[PDB]
Amino acid sequence: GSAPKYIEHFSKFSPSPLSMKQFLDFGSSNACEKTSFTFLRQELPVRLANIMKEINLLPDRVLSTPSVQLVQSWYVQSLLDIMEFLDKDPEDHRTLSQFTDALVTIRNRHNDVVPTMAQGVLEYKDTYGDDPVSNQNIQYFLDRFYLSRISIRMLINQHTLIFDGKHIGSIDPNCNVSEVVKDAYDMAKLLCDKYYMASPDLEIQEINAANSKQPIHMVYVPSHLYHMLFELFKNAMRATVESHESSLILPPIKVMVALGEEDLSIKMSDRGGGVPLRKIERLFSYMYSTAPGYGLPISRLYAKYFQGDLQLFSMEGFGTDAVIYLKALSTDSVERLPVYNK
Amino acid sequence: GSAPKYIEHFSKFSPSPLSMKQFLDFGSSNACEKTSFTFLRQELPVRLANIMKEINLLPDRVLSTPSVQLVQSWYVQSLLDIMEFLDKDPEDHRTLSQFTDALVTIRNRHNDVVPTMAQGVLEYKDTYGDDPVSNQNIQYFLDRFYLSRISIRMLINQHTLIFDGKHIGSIDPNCNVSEVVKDAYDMAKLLCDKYYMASPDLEIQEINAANSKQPIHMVYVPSHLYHMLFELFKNAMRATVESHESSLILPPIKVMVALGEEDLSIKMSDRGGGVPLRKIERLFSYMYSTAPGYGLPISRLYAKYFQGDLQLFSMEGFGTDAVIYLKALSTDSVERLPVYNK
Ligand SMILES: CC(C)[C@@]1(O)c2ccccc2-c2ncccc21
Ligand SMILES: CC(C)[C@@]1(O)c2ccccc2-c2ncccc21
């Protein structure tokens, strides 16, 4: 066919990173489905081909594994689905309707990528070993692959949710940070009560530096923020409950939401006994956190996706602090995308 | 002369990193000045030549500057001072006495290296600019150069303090961490009261996981721990006082000392308004923290010298946490030394 042909062509284009303000203004009242179709039918192949060409640069030891080939076949098929709309007339309403239906099929086709790549990592460790040189290659590639996957899913979610026939797609222009914190806590508390028959309480403190009274709002994607907070709440609850099985007092989980002139920071403090520094630095490694699991590495990619970060600093024998760093301003929240270079 | 000859010879040897337990046991009752002389007359040239050969690999743009040449002339002279004792008889007490006097002269000859390298960094920025590529080369070299300098000064201090004619040289086998914290605080409070006419209070909390009652002691070099804590106290006081000039309540500085099964962690928490994440990552850069200053970068090297670390995580609009990570066990406290490789 022409799959290698399409990859080489669109990989020469660099992806166009969009800011949070561009996502908001494009999806507002002046939202034209035709304009979004013209942009996405070009930008989606560019992002697909860039990561698909980097997959080809992997060694044949990994490229010929069933896990990588299965995922690579999904990207080939999804790329071909977009190719059909290149010559189609954007002025035809049937063209726009079929394009939205085709994006949903691609989205559901890539729904089982996280467990599949986890099987690939386990296969590599049992086939070639777990050397620090291999960990860097796997960490470097999986970070770029997943971040690419997040960005593509973002574009698809914004198109299918807006043009379905307050919230701008998956974006809340007035996202109350504390409310998302409570939701992720409540879900983690539900799971923690069913399995441990006990759960720590929650304490939330807001620090709005410029407006001490005003609640802290931001423009963000609540799903991404929930995923990070839910993952951090599960870890902090597991550590708190297990480190106090012989004790009676169950320390609460303290969360501070701070809004500065540039950052919106969310610190989650637990007293779950802490973790030695040697092990903290390996909690974000796909290879080291795989056993015959990727909550922290993926959660950090969600934060980094809009120029943020997620950092851990523990104190062995006491507890652990987890901090989500987000950009406060929508103009500073720009997509971080991997680009194929030589 | 034969200065390039000695450099090429001893640079082929790798430095021998010593653990904290080796420092303690060698300097104990079975401390033989002859054995320390035989080791140091070989190990000191090896460490000198390794960093001196890496200095030669610098570009001639930096190698020909007066700052680098002045420091390089100190290392050439100090290397030649040790060469005189290679053929001397260790069984002669006059040989051991002159060797100790020669180490003191070398130690005082290298007393003005930090301000000299600071002048070199400022000269480079005004001569060739402050590009991110140049920052990595300067950061990579200065970290290794200073860490090498710390290790050499450590060996000299242990020899001159022990064989001068409870503490094992510069090492306290029962170093009370909280007491060093109070000393660094008291000195910072003295300077802060004279310049700001106000200073925050101190709060210390110890978490001894294995022995909740016992005070937290360790085997460490109190001078190094004081230098790190004093630097962090100055920053936390400056930020706290200045961020509350229009306010009346002056938040205290909270310090937690946690002793785990592997780590001894010291967290210093202030409410000095915090720093955006973008600027935190540049506080450890020699090039970015230079103006027409190196407290944090050098303090981190002291921590890393015995397999520890010093990390910052702030929250803009609230405050900053600073954490010193140290190895709890003396067997895990091994010298981290840069080695000249190809
Ligand atoms: C921001 C893009 C992902 C988007 O595809 C989009 C999604 C949803 C709503 C509108 C628009 C849009 N408008 C113009 C150009 C490009 C686009
Ligand atoms: C640990 C070394 C720096 C040292 O030079 C030393 C310093 C002080 C006291 C004793 C000894 C010693 N003893 C044996 C071998 C080597 C040495």
Side-chain angles (χ1 to χ4, degrees):
Chain A
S2 300
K5 178 175 177 60
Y6 299 147
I7 298 169
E8 182 192 356
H9 173 75
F10 291 92
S11 65
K12 301 176 183 176
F13 291 79
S14 296
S16 295
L18 304 178
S19 71
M20 188 79 61
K21 181 179 176 57
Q22 291 174 301
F23 278 111
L24 198 66
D25 299 338
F26 277 143
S28 301
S29 297
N30 297 328
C32 182
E33 186 176 0
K34 175 177 58 181
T35 305
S36 178
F37 166 76
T38 304
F39 171 80
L40 287 183
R41 70 173 177 178
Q42 173 73 17
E43 181 64 19
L44 291 180
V46 168
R47 299 188 180 190
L48 286 176
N50 274 266
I51 192 64
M52 287 162 74
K53 189 165 184 58
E54 185 172 343
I55 291 172
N56 295 341
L57 293 195
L58 301 176
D60 190 66
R61 315 137 51 189
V62 188
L63 189 65
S64 179
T65 54
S67 64
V68 175
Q69 289 294 344
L70 178 63
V71 175
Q72 191 170 5
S73 70
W74 294 353
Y75 276 76
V76 166
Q77 191 60 44
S78 297
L79 178 60
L80 298 181
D81 295 352
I82 310 294
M83 300 284 92
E84 303 287 341
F85 298 91
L86 296 179
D87 64 331
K88 300 305 176 183
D89 190 5
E91 304 293 338
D92 187 10
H93 295 266
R94 300 175 180 178
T95 297
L96 306 184
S97 180
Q98 297 165 12
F99 184 75
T100 305
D101 303 359
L103 294 185
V104 179
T105 304
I106 294 179
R107 180 181 58 193
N108 304 335
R109 181 185 301 157
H110 296 244
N111 241 333
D112 304 325
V113 186
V114 176
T116 297
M117 288 301 185
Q119 172 66 18
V121 172
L122 181 57
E123 284 181 6
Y124 185 90
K125 301 211 306 297
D126 304 330
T127 304
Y128 300 109
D130 47 0
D131 49 304
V133 181
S134 297
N135 183 29
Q136 299 190 43
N137 295 11
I138 285 184
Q139 186 81 12
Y140 178 82
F141 163 73
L142 286 183
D143 277 353
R144 296 167 64 87
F145 174 78
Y146 280 142
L147 197 61
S148 162
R149 179 184 186 266
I150 294 171
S151 72
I152 298 178
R153 228 167 187 85
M154 177 74 184
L155 303 191
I156 297 181
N157 288 341
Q158 289 301 113
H159 189 85
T160 61
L161 290 173
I162 287 295
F163 311 107
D164 53 359
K166 298 181 179 59
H167 285 61
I168 302 298
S170 69
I171 296 182
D172 192 339
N174 296 275
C175 172
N176 182 280
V177 174
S178 289
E179 177 65 14
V180 183
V181 170
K182 298 179 185 178
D183 291 354
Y185 169 84
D186 291 335
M187 187 63 218
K189 177 178 187 175
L190 214 171
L191 299 176
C192 190
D193 280 336
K194 297 290 293 184
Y195 186 67
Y196 293 104
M197 312 305 178
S199 60
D201 294 324
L202 180 63
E203 292 183 0
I204 299 179
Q205 185 178 13
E206 285 193 13
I207 303 297
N208 193 334
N211 299 270
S212 307
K213 178 188 296 182
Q214 294 187 3
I216 294 176
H217 293 72
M218 75 175 303
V219 184
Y220 204 73
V221 180
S223 303
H224 296 184
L225 181 56
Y226 175 95
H227 185 101
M228 302 184 291
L229 287 161
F230 178 63
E231 182 60 39
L232 295 179
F233 268 129
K234 284 192 299 183
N235 296 335
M237 287 182 179
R238 173 187 300 107
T240 297
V241 176
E242 290 179 350
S243 64
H244 292 74
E245 294 184 358
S246 304
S247 180
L248 289 181
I249 297 179
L250 200 58
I253 297 178
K254 296 183 181 61
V255 169
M256 166 166 293
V257 178
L259 179 62
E261 308 299 321
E262 180 175 338
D263 297 339
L264 205 164
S265 313
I266 311 168
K267 175 174 293 188
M268 181 184 302
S269 300
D270 63 72
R271 302 192 179 189
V275 168
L277 178 66
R278 171 181 51 81
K279 298 180 183 176
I280 285 291
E281 306 173 337
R282 308 186 303 106
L283 287 178
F284 293 99
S285 171
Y286 302 97
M287 167 176 292
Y288 293 158
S289 61
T290 302
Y294 294 158
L296 286 176
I298 295 182
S299 294
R300 184 165 69 176
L301 297 169
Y302 277 110
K304 285 178 177 174
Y305 176 49
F306 283 112
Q307 307 301 322
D309 203 358
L310 193 161
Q311 297 173 359
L312 294 178
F313 53 107
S314 187
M315 294 184 71
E316 189 189 21
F318 181 71
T320 306
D321 287 359
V323 183
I324 302 175
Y325 291 108
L326 306 172
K327 293 295 187 180
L329 308 183
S330 60
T331 51
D332 295 331
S333 306
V334 189
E335 287 183 300
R336 179 171 179 181
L337 308 186
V339 56
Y340 170 81
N341 292 329
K342 178 176 58 181
Chain B
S2 300
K5 178 175 177 60
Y6 299 147
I7 298 169
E8 182 192 356
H9 173 75
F10 291 92
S11 65
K12 301 176 183 176
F13 291 79
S14 296
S16 295
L18 304 178
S19 71
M20 188 79 61
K21 181 179 176 57
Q22 291 174 301
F23 278 111
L24 198 66
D25 299 338
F26 277 143
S28 301
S29 297
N30 297 328
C32 182
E33 186 176 0
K34 175 177 58 181
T35 305
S36 178
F37 166 76
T38 304
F39 171 80
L40 287 183
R41 70 173 177 178
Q42 173 73 17
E43 181 64 19
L44 291 180
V46 168
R47 299 188 180 190
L48 286 176
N50 274 266
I51 192 64
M52 287 162 74
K53 189 165 184 58
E54 185 172 343
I55 291 172
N56 295 341
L57 293 195
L58 301 176
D60 190 66
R61 315 137 51 189
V62 188
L63 189 65
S64 179
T65 54
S67 64
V68 175
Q69 289 294 344
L70 178 63
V71 175
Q72 191 170 5
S73 70
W74 294 353
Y75 276 76
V76 166
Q77 191 60 44
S78 297
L79 178 60
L80 298 181
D81 295 352
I82 310 294
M83 300 284 92
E84 303 287 341
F85 298 91
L86 296 179
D87 64 331
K88 300 305 176 183
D89 190 5
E91 304 293 338
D92 187 10
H93 295 266
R94 300 175 180 178
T95 297
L96 306 184
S97 180
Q98 297 165 12
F99 184 75
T100 305
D101 303 359
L103 294 185
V104 179
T105 304
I106 294 179
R107 180 181 58 193
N108 304 335
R109 181 185 301 157
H110 296 244
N111 241 333
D112 304 325
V113 186
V114 176
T116 297
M117 288 301 185
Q119 172 66 18
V121 172
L122 181 57
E123 284 181 6
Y124 185 90
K125 301 211 306 297
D126 304 330
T127 304
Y128 300 109
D130 47 0
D131 49 304
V133 181
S134 297
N135 183 29
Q136 299 190 43
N137 295 11
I138 285 184
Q139 186 81 12
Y140 178 82
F141 163 73
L142 286 183
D143 277 353
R144 296 167 64 87
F145 174 78
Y146 280 142
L147 197 61
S148 162
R149 179 184 186 266
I150 294 171
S151 72
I152 298 178
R153 228 167 187 85
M154 177 74 184
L155 303 191
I156 297 181
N157 288 341
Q158 289 301 113
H159 189 85
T160 61
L161 290 173
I162 287 295
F163 311 107
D164 53 359
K166 298 181 179 59
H167 285 61
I168 302 298
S170 69
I171 296 182
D172 192 339
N174 296 275
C175 172
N176 182 280
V177 174
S178 289
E179 177 65 14
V180 183
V181 170
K182 298 179 185 178
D183 291 354
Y185 169 84
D186 291 335
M187 187 63 218
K189 177 178 187 175
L190 214 171
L191 299 176
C192 190
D193 280 336
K194 297 290 293 184
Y195 186 67
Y196 293 104
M197 312 305 178
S199 60
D201 294 324
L202 180 63
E203 292 183 0
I204 299 179
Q205 185 178 13
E206 285 193 13
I207 303 297
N208 193 334
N211 299 270
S212 307
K213 178 188 296 182
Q214 294 187 3
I216 294 176
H217 293 72
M218 75 175 303
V219 184
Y220 204 73
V221 180
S223 303
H224 296 184
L225 181 56
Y226 175 95
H227 185 101
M228 302 184 291
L229 287 161
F230 178 63
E231 182 60 39
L232 295 179
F233 268 129
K234 284 192 299 183
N235 296 335
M237 287 182 179
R238 173 187 300 107
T240 297
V241 176
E242 290 179 350
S243 64
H244 292 74
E245 294 184 358
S246 304
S247 180
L248 289 181
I249 297 179
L250 200 58
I253 297 178
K254 296 183 181 61
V255 169
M256 166 166 293
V257 178
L259 179 62
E261 308 299 321
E262 180 175 338
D263 297 339
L264 205 164
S265 313
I266 311 168
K267 175 174 293 188
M268 181 184 302
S269 300
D270 63 72
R271 302 192 179 189
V275 168
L277 178 66
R278 171 181 51 81
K279 298 180 183 176
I280 285 291
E281 306 173 337
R282 308 186 303 106
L283 287 178
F284 293 99
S285 171
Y286 302 97
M287 167 176 292
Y288 293 158
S289 61
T290 302
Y294 294 158
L296 286 176
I298 295 182
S299 294
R300 184 165 69 176
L301 297 169
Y302 277 110
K304 285 178 177 174
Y305 176 49
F306 283 112
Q307 307 301 322
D309 203 358
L310 193 161
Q311 297 173 359
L312 294 178
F313 53 107
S314 187
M315 294 184 71
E316 189 189 21
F318 181 71
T320 306
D321 287 359
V323 183
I324 302 175
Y325 291 108
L326 306 172
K327 293 295 187 180
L329 308 183
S330 60
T331 51
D332 295 331
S333 306
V334 189
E335 287 183 300
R336 179 171 179 181
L337 308 186
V339 56
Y340 170 81
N341 292 329
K342 178 176 58 181

